[PDB]
Amino acid sequence: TLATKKATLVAALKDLQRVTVAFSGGIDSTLVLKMALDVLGRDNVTAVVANSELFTDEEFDKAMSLAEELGANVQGTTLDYLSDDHIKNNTPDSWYYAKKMFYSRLNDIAANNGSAAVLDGMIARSLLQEADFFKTDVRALAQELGLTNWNKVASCSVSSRFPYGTTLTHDNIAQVMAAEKYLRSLGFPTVRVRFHNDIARIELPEARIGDFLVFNDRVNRQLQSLGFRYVTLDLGGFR
Amino acid sequence: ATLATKKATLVAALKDLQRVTVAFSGGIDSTLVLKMALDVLGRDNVTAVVANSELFTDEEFDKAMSLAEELGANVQGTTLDYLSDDHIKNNTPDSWYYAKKMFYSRLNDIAANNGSAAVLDGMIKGARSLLQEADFFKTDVRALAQELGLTNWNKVASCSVSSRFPYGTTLTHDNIAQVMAAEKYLRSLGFPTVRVRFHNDIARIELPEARIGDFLVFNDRVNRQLQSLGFRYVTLDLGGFRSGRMNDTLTKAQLATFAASWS
Amino acid sequence: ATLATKKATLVAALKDLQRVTVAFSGGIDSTLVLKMALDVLGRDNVTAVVANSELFTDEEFDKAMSLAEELGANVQGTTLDYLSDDHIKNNTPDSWYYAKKMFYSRLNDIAANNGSAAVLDGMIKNLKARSEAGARSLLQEADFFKTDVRALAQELGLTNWNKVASCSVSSRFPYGTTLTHDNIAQVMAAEKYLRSLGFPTVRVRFHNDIARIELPEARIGDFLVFNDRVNRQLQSLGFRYVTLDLGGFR
Amino acid sequence: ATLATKKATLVAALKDLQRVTVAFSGGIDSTLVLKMALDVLGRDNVTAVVANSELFTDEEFDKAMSLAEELGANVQGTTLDYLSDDHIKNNTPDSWYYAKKMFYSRLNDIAANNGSAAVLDGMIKARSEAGARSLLQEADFFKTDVRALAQELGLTNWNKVASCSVSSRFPYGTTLTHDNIAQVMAAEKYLRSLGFPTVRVRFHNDIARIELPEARIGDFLVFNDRVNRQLQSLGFRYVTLDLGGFRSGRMNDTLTKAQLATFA
Amino acid sequence: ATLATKKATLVAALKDLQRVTVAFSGGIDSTLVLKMALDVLGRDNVTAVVANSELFTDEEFDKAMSLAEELGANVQGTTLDYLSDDHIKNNTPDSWYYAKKMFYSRLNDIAANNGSAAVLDGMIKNKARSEAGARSLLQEADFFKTDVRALAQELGLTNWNKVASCSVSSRFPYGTTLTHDNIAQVMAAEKYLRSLGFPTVRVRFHNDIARIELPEARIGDFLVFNDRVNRQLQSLGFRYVTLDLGGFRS
Amino acid sequence: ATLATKKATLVAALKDLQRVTVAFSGGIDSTLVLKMALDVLGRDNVTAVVANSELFTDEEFDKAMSLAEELGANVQGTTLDYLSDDHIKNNTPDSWYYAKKMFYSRLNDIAANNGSAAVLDGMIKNAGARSLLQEADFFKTDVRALAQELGLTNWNKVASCSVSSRFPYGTTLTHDNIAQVMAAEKYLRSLGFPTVRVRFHNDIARIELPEARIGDFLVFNDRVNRQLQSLGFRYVTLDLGGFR
Ligand SMILES: Nc1ncnc2c1ncn2[C@@H]1O[C@H](COP(=O)(O)OP(=O)(O)OP(=O)(O)O)[C@@H](O)[C@H]1O
Ligand SMILES: Nc1ncnc2c1ncn2[C@@H]1O[C@H](COP(=O)(O)OP(=O)(O)OP(=O)(O)O)[C@@H](O)[C@H]1O
Ligand SMILES: Nc1ncnc2c1ncn2[C@@H]1O[C@H](COP(=O)(O)OP(=O)(O)OP(=O)(O)O)[C@@H](O)[C@H]1O
Ligand SMILES: Nc1ncnc2c1ncn2[C@@H]1O[C@H](COP(=O)(O)OP(=O)(O)OP(=O)(O)O)[C@@H](O)[C@H]1O
Ligand SMILES: Nc1ncnc2c1ncn2[C@@H]1O[C@H](COP(=O)(O)OP(=O)(O)OP(=O)(O)O)[C@@H](O)[C@H]1O
Ligand SMILES: Nc1ncnc2c1ncn2[C@@H]1O[C@H](COP(=O)(O)OP(=O)(O)OP(=O)(O)O)[C@@H](O)[C@H]1O
Ligand SMILES: [Mg+2]
Ligand SMILES: [Mg+2]
Ligand SMILES: [Mg+2]
Ligand SMILES: [Mg+2]
Ligand SMILES: [Mg+2]
Ligand SMILES: [Mg+2]
């Protein structure tokens, strides 16, 4: 039952005392943070929102507001992922070196503010995952707590827009980020502007490509003014 | 009158029954009944029963079983053999009634053995439909479900696969699986509301009209996929899913007459 | 041989016949036969005949009638009752021979009654019913292939002819399905309505209570604005379900 | 009767007249009259007149002048100011008639000054007021007889594109101006330039209401934004697409085509 | 500083007022106010008022009345005749203000007649209200949008009208006279279009023209309804039914 | 000037030349020229030459050979190797110049060897070759009018362009990369899109379509994607700007 799973989560937090919660602003880390606040109190919880080049300022700013809005003391940290050459040169194992810096930075903060653990929200401790929370358990328990506000856009590292072996730069990331942001603003929340030097190759879910046709000309000019020479749509669609 | 009066009628009927067996489909209506029964009578006085059958997907049974447990109910699966009844097997126009009889015979048998005073279902405006007795309309169901914190249920209206077949066509495991696989494939492309109507060698696909503009990119893949499942011709119904429900005043009048001409 | 030798062969055969009846479909081949008959024998000595029937559209008929007039021929329409022949009515693979037999029988009656020496059709080189009725395919006898037809038509200044290939409506019904006046009309009215929307190439395949519409796949995107009207229009023609074949044309 | 008799009637009427002024639009009908007039009376006895005006495109006028020259006729262009008549300028339901009145008046003036015996048009009361002669109609030509004789005469060049007075883009009672006429003409030309040869930009003050064949509306969506901006820069505040399309109800099922005709 | 400090300011202002009349729209803000008013003053000391009018739909009124009941408040509906004010009727750029003037006038009449010490609305930190002395307690306690959601969550509030309504006058050009008939026809058109799956829509009124505003991303799927939408809005009184090429809020 | 006047100028020039070799593409312009030459000089005094090459399609070549015979000309096929020239093969902005040199050079050899007085092509208004339509001031509208008057109706209506334009400047043309682009465009034309470019970007194909056609193309996305991948592209894409 959900009530049995919440007790597992309630009990696990009680044993840990002071915690540092890795907070993404999504529904999962939102549930963890609110449950931590409810059982341990605001003086014993630290919300950490990681800012970095591989994810959007909109997600960072949204998460920072939501943690404060949920009543947690919130702290920002900036990771410089591109200082790592594996990330900078986008190898197939970049993902690994990024996570190392992420968890290292939160492990440093937790040891430095007296936390007993770093917590995350995977379906470090994933107490939701240890308590056998499914996606549906997350929804019911959050509604029960009166939670309705969280970032519903699933973010993924911008390195996925670049081929392996391509050097990431500050300029490349900003160009892809602005292009994807413009496209979401047209009504397409799921999109990728895959970077191929002078070509942008846009990925949309195949079910959305018919609706996109009204925007062809505007997207072409906009992504050209961001620096692409050719703006194209992948016939295979998203993934 | 207000929702609170409708809720109070519901609480009162539940307490009077003491022990209930709740037929739980996973839709929003039976969820509210199940939630209310647990809350007023307690978990030891409620048995959630989910009927699994050949006419419905294992996906709906599994989803329903998990939701009943997640709400804190003891839930037991039971399997009905609808195709053992000749009216159902040959899909007569009253097949629905013998299916419902076989359904309710099974839940009354379960109720007698677990000491329940009644079988509850989620019918709204031998079994008891407390939502209907308390004058719940569809909007009342949604308001109390929101008030109660209920957010998980199957939001796609489930329907017996017999409706995909003409009256008089014999249902088989082969033709049922053929219809379900076609519907599962179409859902897997992003069309959660769809019907693959069976007409022997013709597949007639029904979509919400608002989605048919999106579908064209899949024409060739759906054609070839449904052919390998056994159809010779794969077609899209021009009237779409629930023809006439979206139409202007004159053409809903016209399509309703067309729909009555084949009564 | 040269186009000129083939043209000369055709001219001499026409001269020998003096008076002719041309089976005129409006297509390029009988257009060439008809124009040549006119040029060699004169308008007074040529009767152009367009057959109207239940298995083909009135639009194809009226178009041929106007085209023959435009070439300067006296044209007469005749009606065939193909469904009175049970071999046609029962839609077997050999129905088309009995259709052509009835067709050539009517043209021989017309030719006999106006004193023509032959019935002419536009068969070209690369048919039993034609020879058994004694009709002449002078383009085929003169070794005209399709490019010879185009070459002589260009030389004659012919530029207007019916470019739409006609097909008997019986292809809308599966083999063994009985043709009736009502089910033929139902398919014809349906296809005529769909063409009127801007789809000149279309098929309404008959499957009793199901209409299965075939469109060129490149046109299906345009069709969506018409879904509801086509659905209701074809139900009012008697179908229970109106469907679009996901496979497209043929 | 027979085609040969209809041609003879036409030839004789031409001979009885001896000198004519032929109203030449460039269409097939006035092309046939002009060719027959030349053949019977000779170029010195035929004057081709092409009327230019604000209610039609410059392309069609220039096209007609060249076509008459191609037939070997002495041709005169004349310009009409239809907007000087208040019925035309204020677009009343009878505006068309006063347009023809001004048209036939100007051609009669030309014919009287060059010594023609009649004005000829290619029609198959403004003519009975002016004295205009429709010799094809007096000889009972139908449309196919016009086609037969044009082919028989070896005519192959004429304007096959249907022209329509731009006054039809304006509601009755709306004042035509040089500006709003040019505004409508510029809009339709832009839409034709995108690949839409059958189109109307109906004028509704600050609104443009575009009529397209419905089979084209799906492809048109790729141009929405460019059309919106282009027609706004021509002076419309709102650029809209008629949901009923070009010639509403002509492509509707029987029930809803009679309900669309009832509403109108 | 903190939500708690802001909540405290609001609670004290509520206590100081003892008895209040709450202007309840059904939205999140006035939902927060009404819940705070009920929790602090008790159900006998708060009157929830939902304004019904021609410039808004019966559906939003029915939702707000029902929502106020769900919160456990005594709620009373009142009807405003916005069209009685000629500034509103002739839709000048100042129509909005004369509407709010009439609104706050009616709420003061109710509050004075039930013995309330103030009318409360749900204005937050982010006009004709101050020209009536109505109190925006969330605004005085410096509630921003995040504070409203933060406190609503803490109070267990999850149910409110999430669809922001908009006065139907925005469908009419400045200088256009609003009538009972043209308001109702614009409202029925938008309702019919919402019923097709377009919750964000505008039917702009231009006498005999309806100019429909849709999000551009929806227009590809909308084509399947063109003819039905065309005939439906003509049956409502439009002579022409059109789609704005610029989309929603062009 | 009237069409009859320009045609008369054309007739006189042809008579003046007596014997000509006509560079025949199958398009409307060279079709008009070829027909006028045949009509004025007779089949014995006209040689139609159709150039086959690696930069233009075998289909357009076969169509012209058929069209020349149908027009009543003795027609000769000749094969050019544009790629044997390094300027062409290395695809610079000067490639066109060497291509035209090689083209007119081969036609001059043919014309000199059969005794023609000139090579004729179909240039219209707006080298060692005569463009009689341009000298007689034919515009596109005059070409069509005279073509109709002559009863000409059959010609290749899709405007041809050297395949080298599918590759960026500085990209070396190969037999393989050309064939890959030629197969991709042929597949696309076979679906009903006679105007298309498959622009080559190594592992990316960038398809250009007339924008008016892009709405209908969507029913083909997956098949074009799969087909152009088996031809060797990794990503198959559509240019949002459309054709040209
Ligand atoms: N900027 C970030 N800052 C802090 N924590 C993060 C951040 N991004 C990801 N995480 C942490 O890592 C966990 C898993 O990350 P991820 O976003 O990939 O999965 P998720 O399903 O979206 O979880 P969530 O719903 O919490 O966002 C989050 O629950 C969260 O604890
Ligand atoms: N497989 C099933 N297993 C158990 N109970 C079922 C099942 N299907 C239907 N029911 C029960 O019988 C009632 C009838 O459900 P039905 O599908 O006919 O309408 P419904 O609106 O979908 O109901 P609901 O919202 O409760 O799912 C359900 O409310 C539920 O109580
Ligand atoms: N409705 C018809 N009316 C008169 N003759 C017809 C008709 N249909 C076919 N024919 C005659 O029979 C001949 C064969 O017609 P068929 O359609 O099988 O071949 P075709 O290639 O289309 O020839 P064509 O170019 O003349 O149309 C025609 O050339 C014509 O002479
Ligand atoms: N600009 C114009 N200039 C001179 N005459 C004109 C002009 N427009 C129309 N006409 C003349 O008035 C007659 C009627 O023209 P109308 O457009 O009404 O019919 P039509 O069927 O198109 O005739 P046509 O084939 O000659 O174009 C024409 O036949 C022609 O004689
Ligand atoms: N029909 C109405 N009846 C009663 N009060 C209303 C009504 N409409 C608006 N209001 C009141 O006026 C205040 C502001 O109105 P408005 O809708 O413009 O802003 P809002 O930000 O949407 O507020 P809310 O979230 O409460 O709906 C509302 O918070 C509410 O107190
Ligand atoms: N494969 C080719 N073979 C023979 N001649 C050619 C060929 N391609 C071009 N030409 C000749 O050179 C001239 C210029 O051709 P080009 O394609 O560049 O322009 P064009 O407008 O298409 O002319 P056309 O209508 O005749 O094809 C042609 O008219 C023709 O005379
Ligand atoms: Mg997340
Ligand atoms: Mg259900
Ligand atoms: Mg034929
Ligand atoms: Mg005309
Ligand atoms: Mg609101
Ligand atoms: Mg060419």
Short note summarizing the structure:
Chain B: It comes from Lactiplantibacillus plantarum (strain ATCC BAA-793 / NCIMB 8826 / WCFS1) (Lactobacillus plantarum). Chain B: The modification 2,3-didehydroalanine (Cys) is found at residue 159. Six copies of one chain form a homohexamer. By secondary structure, chain A is α/β, with parallel strands linked by helices.
Quickly list its features.
homohexamer, 239 residues, alpha/beta, 2 domains, 4-stranded parallel beta sheet, 3-stranded mixed beta sheet, 10 helices, 7 strands, 46% helix, binds adenosine-5'-triphosphate, binds magnesium ion, LarE (chain F), Ni-pincer_cofactor_biosynth (chain F)
Please provide a written account of the structure:
The structure is a homohexamer. The first copy, chain A, is of the alpha/beta class and 239 residues long. Chain A folds into two domains: 1-156, no CATH class; 157-239, no CATH class. Chain A is 46% helix and 15% strand. Chain A has ten helices and seven strands. Chain A has helices at residues 2-16, 27-40, 57-69, 85-88, 94-112, 127-130, 135-144, 170-185, 209-212, 216-225, and strands at 19-22, 45-51, 73-78, 117-119, 192-196, 199-203, 230-234. In chain A, α2 (27-40) packs across α7. Chains B and C meet through β6, α9, α10, β7 and α11 of B and β6, α11 and β7 of C. The complex binds adenosine-5'-triphosphate (ATP) (6 copies) and magnesium ion (MG) (6 copies). One adenosine-5'-triphosphate binds next to α2 and β2 of chain E. Chain E: It holds the Pfam family NAD_synthase. Chain E: This is Pyridinium-3,5-bisthiocarboxylic acid mononucleotide synthase. Chain E: One of its GO terms (molecular function) is ATP binding. Chain E: Keywords: ATP-binding, Lyase, Nickel, Nucleotide-binding.
